[PDB]
Write a protein that binds this ligand. Structure first.
Ligand SMILES: Cc1cc(-n2c(=O)c3cc(Cl)c(C(=O)C4=C(O)CCCC4=O)cc3n(C)c2=O)n(C)n1
Ligand SMILES: Cc1cc(-n2c(=O)c3cc(Cl)c(C(=O)C4=C(O)CCCC4=O)cc3n(C)c2=O)n(C)n1
Ligand SMILES: [Co+2]
Ligand SMILES: [Co+2]
Lengths: 380, 380
């Protein structure tokens, strides 16, 4: 069921912002590992004395990487005279975030019709304000409320290219890498307690629970057209294997964003390209599932993928799950940084065509039991 | 003249340690951009609950990248019970260093006969102690004294592979990249005042002044065989163009390491390989000198390089300088991180064969006047 209860008009995911200590090195690593192009910048070369911010793009996906400069560069400025292109930025907040959590997502940004109204209605419905609405160059309005931990939900609205104060990057420095990644599919948070977190977020957004079909319980909030998907996990304590959610919470120093799922238009091409670069600066992937796994997929998705393609999943280590209206191809990276916290999922969805409706195939929770049983069968 | 006044036996540069906020992303970027292999690690997977440290190697060059974990992971430990593989490490020092300077070199490490004796003699001769000698696994001794700013000189001695507590990296994760870089040639510091800095360092090491042949005055300290070379710069104020040393000091929040010079066995191959990767995750280089420059090199080094090779310097943007016993090929990267502070030099030296003696060709200070005059001639 979809009651369409959004308390304000939401459009799509807009960008994800990482808070870093050195934006350059993280952005260059991500660009090479994921096949994203350098498209915009705001830094010393553009007059920004406060923070260095670099934008990577692939299809509709926008990754922003931001780090603070020395506060001494901007000590004469006041908020009305700031050279920061993102007015919510604060040196102390950013250094406290990175020293506390290490590399991670600070903002999940969604585009809305009216960011000032979204902020007002959100806070009137229980949202804890983070940064009030500010209008940038009479063109864009941005506002921020708390989502979970030190992660914020950022509203962006345009009257009528990223943000004012950002410059398009030189053609020479902008190499057109592309491994087929096209858009953000969902962004997932880990919290100690699921109930209060859902009640809080669903309370100020009006997002509804998206129904689906080990180590965690979770629930998915979705916007009216179910294109903005915000799952949340909590641990389950007292099992044989320690919950990966609890491990996250300890190493992250509390709640925060667990994974980003990026939609590919050709998950085979994406994973061939990413795996080619794993040991030369890119991303490592989860251990591949036992042979027994792929020996059972024919009996479960043999109607959607040919024998050639299931052996292509074989090589790349892709997992496949199936709901009632669609099928889901998915694979997970190892953690993106030093700590066992944030990672990335690559996905492709098959079915549910009207365009494709959101969440087609679910989030792969059937692969929990399938992988467990398959580990046992390979042992035998 | 070389008085050979070293107060203790010094061998060679051993490693350079960068203090980072995320060691993984910096190390992966550097490995791809410079062609260095992942050879050793100390982190959660090796039992280190304190810091993540990754070692890159190319020839004899060793780059170490270290970042702190959450202090909560090791809150029960005391120094006698520590799981840190580098006992000098301190969470607060590391976070204070990175928030103050951003990405930069924390330690310049040289191998000595006896690190405990080097420390004692150094401090008896004015060195400010940083970390007393500690013997690791009855096998290696390390000790640290202050060099300039928050950079330390690290003594390492072996009784008889990097350090105890580090593990060799898996063959699958260790891809054998190599662009021809072979060893560290010199490591250069920027200070506000040259006199007191030289007096301090020469005072506790016995290093002597290595003689050579705009915006700075500098001086080079050298060990007995002149294989450990430690230049130091200060600004010259009151010129037309603002001194790059003063710019460094402002953006770095004071003194620190300015550049690392890496010797290549084939600087043409190194720069073809590095420039191929500049826009796909590697390093950018200085703007190439005007055409008039290469139109004058035949008249100055035409005896050492052929017309084919001088036009090969043409393409790659290599500079060439010449002293009285040797010739120097050199080129500079853009800054390695967000701030206009640390950069890298690639060099190759020609001449002075007995093996090659150190400093053969100097440090390129003749290229200052040559580039100025060449900019004028291209304007004409
Ligand atoms: C190996 C191996 C591998 C897995 N494993 C996982 O850990 C695993 C962890 C996560 Cl966070 C997700 C996931 O994407 C998801 C959402 O986006 C929303 C609701 C919560 C949720 O689960 C899927 C996983 N899948 C499919 C999987 O197969 N297991 C259990 N063992
Ligand atoms: C363009 C352009 C380009 C340069 N330029 C520089 O900035 C420049 C800056 C430095 Cl720090 C060095 C250098 O390596 C060096 C030492 O290692 C020890 C003593 C101090 C010293 O100078 C060489 C440079 N060279 C050759 C050069 O050509 N100028 C002046 N203009
Ligand atoms: Co997911
Ligand atoms: Co130099």
């Amino acid at each position: 069921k979809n009651p369409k209860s959004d308390k304000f008009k939401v459009k799509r995911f807009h960008h994800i912002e990482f808070w870093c200590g050195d934006a350059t090195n993280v952005a260059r690593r991500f660009s090479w590992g994921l096949g994203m192009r350098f498209s915009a910048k705001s830094d010393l070369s553009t007059g920004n004395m406060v923070h260095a911010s670099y934008l990577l793009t692939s299809g509709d996906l926008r990754f922003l990487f931001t780090a603070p400069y020395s506060p001494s560069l901007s000590a004469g400025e006041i908020k009305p005279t700031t050279t920061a292109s993102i007015p919510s930025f604060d040196h102390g907040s950013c250094r406290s975030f990175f020293s506390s959590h290490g590399l991670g997502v600070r903002a999940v940004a969604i585009e809305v019709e009216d960011a000032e109204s979204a902020f007002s209605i959100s806070v009137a419905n229980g949202a804890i304000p983070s940064s009030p609405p500010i209008v940038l160059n009479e063109a864009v309005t941005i506002a921020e409320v708390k989502l979970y931990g030190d992660v914020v939900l950022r509203y962006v609205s345009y009257k009528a290219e990223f943000l004012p104060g950002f410059e398009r990057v030189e053609d020479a420095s902008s190499f057109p890498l592309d491994y087929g990644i096209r858009r953000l599919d969902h962004a997932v948070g880990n919290v100690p307690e699921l109930g209060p977190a859902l009640t809080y977020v669903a309370g100020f957004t009006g997002f509804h629970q998206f129904a689906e079909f080990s180590g965690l319980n979770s629930a998915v909030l979705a916007s009216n057209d179910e294109m903005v998907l915000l799952p949340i996990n909590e641990p389950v304590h007292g099992t044989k294997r320690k919950s990966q959610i609890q491990t996250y919470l300890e190493h992250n120093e509390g709640a925060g964003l667990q994974h980003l799922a990026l939609m590919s238009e050709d998950i085979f091409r994406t994973l061939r390209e990413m795996r080619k670069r794993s040991s030369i600066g890119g991303f490592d992937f989860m251990p591949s599932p036992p042979p027994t796994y792929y020996q059972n997929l024919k009996k479960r998705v043999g109607d959607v993928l040919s024998d050639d393609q299931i052996k292509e999943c074989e090589e790349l280590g892709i997992l496949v799950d199936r709901d009632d209206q669609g099928t889901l191809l998915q694979i997970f990276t190892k953690p993106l940084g030093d700590r066992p916290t944030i990672f990335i999922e690559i996905i492709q969805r098959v079915g549910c065509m009207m365009y494709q409706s959101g969440g087609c195939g679910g989030f792969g929770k059937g692969n929990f039991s399938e992988l467990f049983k398959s580990i046992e069968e390979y042992e035998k």
